[PDB]
Design an enzyme around this catalytic site. Structure first.
Site, PDB file in Angstrom:
ATOM      1  N   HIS A   1     -53.869 -56.976 -23.311  1.00  0.00           N
ATOM      2  CA  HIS A   1     -54.529 -56.809 -22.013  1.00  0.00           C
ATOM      3  C   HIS A   1     -55.573 -57.900 -21.719  1.00  0.00           C
ATOM      4  O   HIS A   1     -56.151 -57.892 -20.622  1.00  0.00           O
ATOM      5  CB  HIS A   1     -55.110 -55.394 -21.811  1.00  0.00           C
ATOM      6  CG  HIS A   1     -56.313 -55.077 -22.631  1.00  0.00           C
ATOM      7  ND1 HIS A   1     -56.251 -54.173 -23.666  1.00  0.00           N
ATOM      8  CD2 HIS A   1     -57.595 -55.500 -22.499  1.00  0.00           C
ATOM      9  CE1 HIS A   1     -57.481 -54.105 -24.157  1.00  0.00           C
ATOM     10  NE2 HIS A   1     -58.325 -54.865 -23.476  1.00  0.00           N
TER      11      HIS A   1
ATOM     12  N   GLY B   1     -65.736 -54.993 -24.096  1.00  0.00           N
ATOM     13  CA  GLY B   1     -65.711 -56.239 -24.840  1.00  0.00           C
ATOM     14  C   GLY B   1     -65.411 -56.057 -26.318  1.00  0.00           C
ATOM     15  O   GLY B   1     -65.164 -57.050 -27.003  1.00  0.00           O
TER      16      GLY B   1
ATOM     17  N   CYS C   1     -62.717 -54.634 -27.522  1.00  0.00           N
ATOM     18  CA  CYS C   1     -61.270 -54.653 -27.757  1.00  0.00           C
ATOM     19  C   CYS C   1     -60.889 -55.852 -28.625  1.00  0.00           C
ATOM     20  O   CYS C   1     -61.578 -56.871 -28.600  1.00  0.00           O
ATOM     21  CB  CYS C   1     -60.512 -54.620 -26.431  1.00  0.00           C
ATOM     22  SG  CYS C   1     -60.943 -53.208 -25.379  1.00  0.00           S
TER      23      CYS C   1
END
Ligand SMILES: C[C@@H]1COc2ccc(Cl)cc2[C@@H]1C(=O)Nc1cncc2ccccc12
Ligand SMILES: C[C@@H]1COc2ccc(Cl)cc2[C@@H]1C(=O)Nc1cncc2ccccc12
Lengths: 304, 304
Positions: B41, B143, B145
């Site tokens: 993503h 942030g 991830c």
């Protein structure tokens, strides 16, 4: 969101861990620059620990008697000296992995991460607090002495603790990095009174703010209290007296959520008096006191 | 003695953390050898997340669009490819700090350490479990991830998790290192049912053995139970059914303390039915299920 008993990343401290052996006693050492810091009881035998004369014991030791090993390489000892309850072994090689560092004396109620080590090798890392009675509730087995506690400000590692002893009570005691014991403990195998502990009130309040930030709001009530009223409850439940400095330290968290510090004190008062009625706050069924207001802001903001 | 929610030392994983930026989206990447692994993503905008066509979105991206930075140095991307929900950016430089490693798919109920990262920089490390419903109760902000979960066997790092998404419920979901989601989650910003969770019974029992090893023995009783009787109680309290494999896994702990697995099941039964009456076990006022029998043996023996 989510709130965890998070420890600092231990990498900068893993590179400092060495094994120090003297006679038949092996424990952990901390290699910063050309100095290896380790608990002074590395020179004792199991019998010596009952009533050791460290000045006399060290007099029998020479630089070559302290075997310092880092992973699989031997460090050459060019000098030894005893500062309080630690030994400083000067080595001929500066640690290539020395981070930026300070030695600090933490205050009771402050938190820090511990990298537990065995034979100079790290086994795990965990977050814990200096209890108000200057003990720590660590997880330490034999051979873990010399494991250090620390905090990390971006690239600077602030060493605050070195593990030395487990009291008969199962709680732990240690020194700052200049060998001074936190609390009244001496490095002798004798019964030592740890003293009455209390719960770190400023920390419980900080964790109540964290719970509000992360979704748990059931403990919030329609009440307020004063410092004097709250403190009467705090005494009854063996909680540290809350001062205006504790309130000021809680300022940013009070601003974030908009819940006045005394209003949150009234929530804590009702929880102390009524318990949690079988409910949880941030996955805990008790009132957690191992998160400082600084820890809560750091974890809920993302500080790296 | 002492028992803590100990995490593995994060040093070997800290050296793998990079920042990956694509367009205006920044998250964390994992640099092992000449490959950077990050959640797919990273190619989406905030709008794209509602219903993303990742094949279509990636078609618009080229090697030069993925900015990979490690500390303060830029990595040259010579290839990109999407495997399930992760992106593999081949870089021209192998990570000089790559440890020995494996990619593993953990089982629900297993535990692991997470090194939470922001902008490729580690903020903290914490121990957690894969819930039976394949979620984790982490502490992750925007942030984070690309932060990874792992276990460490001496020098080998077994990567099991990569963080991708926080569900509206505040719980977290992620993938193994081949981009496959644990559980039924898809990487879309839509409501997703996490499913009914249960308590990891084998883990609660393992932690009861740890409490006995470390001194807490008040919960031990004069009773015994059978698997069938215990399981009837387990169902009533939403605990995982205990099997003979769980009993066999508890074997070494049963041997250490001399408390038969079914006898400890009878202690757990009485605790489930009667609660803890305002008492604690290893500093917790609830029944802890985030320590595996392996974790308990490792912590109580000293494995480095
Ligand atoms: C054993 C002796 C007891 O008397 C003193 C007295 C003083 C000092 Cl500075 C050390 C010791 C030693 C000790 O506590 N070491 C340990 C420290 N941590 C965990 C331990 C787990 C198990 C076994 C020892 C541990
Ligand atoms: C925000 C979107 C929501 O929808 C999806 C949907 C799918 C995926 Cl794979 C990611 C996201 C994003 C998300 O959850 N990211 C985050 C992951 N962790 C902690 C977060 C804390 C705060 C803000 C975002 C977090």
């Amino acid at each position: 969101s989510g709130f965890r008993k998070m420890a600092f990343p231990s990498g900068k401290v893993e590179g400092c861990m060495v094994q120090v052996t003297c006679g038949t006693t092996t424990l952990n050492g901390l290699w910063l620059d050309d100095v290896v810091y380790c608990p002074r009881h590395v020179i004792c035998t199991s019998e010596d620990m009952l009533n050791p004369n460290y000045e006399d014991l060290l007099i029998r030791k020479s630089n070559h008697n302290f075997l310092v090993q880092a992973g699989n390489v031997q460090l050459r000892v060019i000098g030894h000296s005893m500062q309080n309850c630690v030994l400083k072994l000067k080595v001929d090689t500066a640690n290539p992995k020395t981070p930026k560092y300070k030695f600090v004396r933490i205050q009771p109620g402050q938190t820090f991460s511990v990298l537990a080590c065995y034979n100079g090798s790290p086994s795990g890392v965990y977050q814990c607090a200096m209890r108000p009675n200057f003990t720590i509730k660590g997880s330490f087995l034999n051979g873990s002495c010399g494991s250090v506690g620390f905090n990390i400000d971006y690239d600077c590692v602030s060493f605050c603790y070195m593990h030395h002893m487990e009291l008969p009570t199962g709680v732990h005691a240690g020194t700052d990095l200049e060998g001074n014991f936190y609390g009244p403990f001496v490095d002798r195998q004798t019964a030592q009174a740890a003293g009455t502990d209390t719960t770190i009130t400023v920390n419980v309040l900080a964790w109540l703010y964290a719970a509000v930030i992360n979704g748990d709001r059931w403990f919030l009530n329609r009440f307020t209290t004063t410092l004097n009223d709250f403190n009467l409850v705090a005494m009854k439940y063996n909680y540290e007296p809350l001062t205006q400095d504790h309130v000021d330290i809680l300022g940013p968290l009070s601003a974030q959520t908009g819940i006045a510090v005394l209003d949150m004190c009234a929530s804590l008062k009702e929880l102390l008096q009524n318990g949690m009625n079988g409910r949880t706050i941030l996955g805990s069924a008790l009132l957690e006191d191992e998160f400082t207001p600084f820890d809560v802001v750091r974890q809920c903001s993302g500080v790296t």
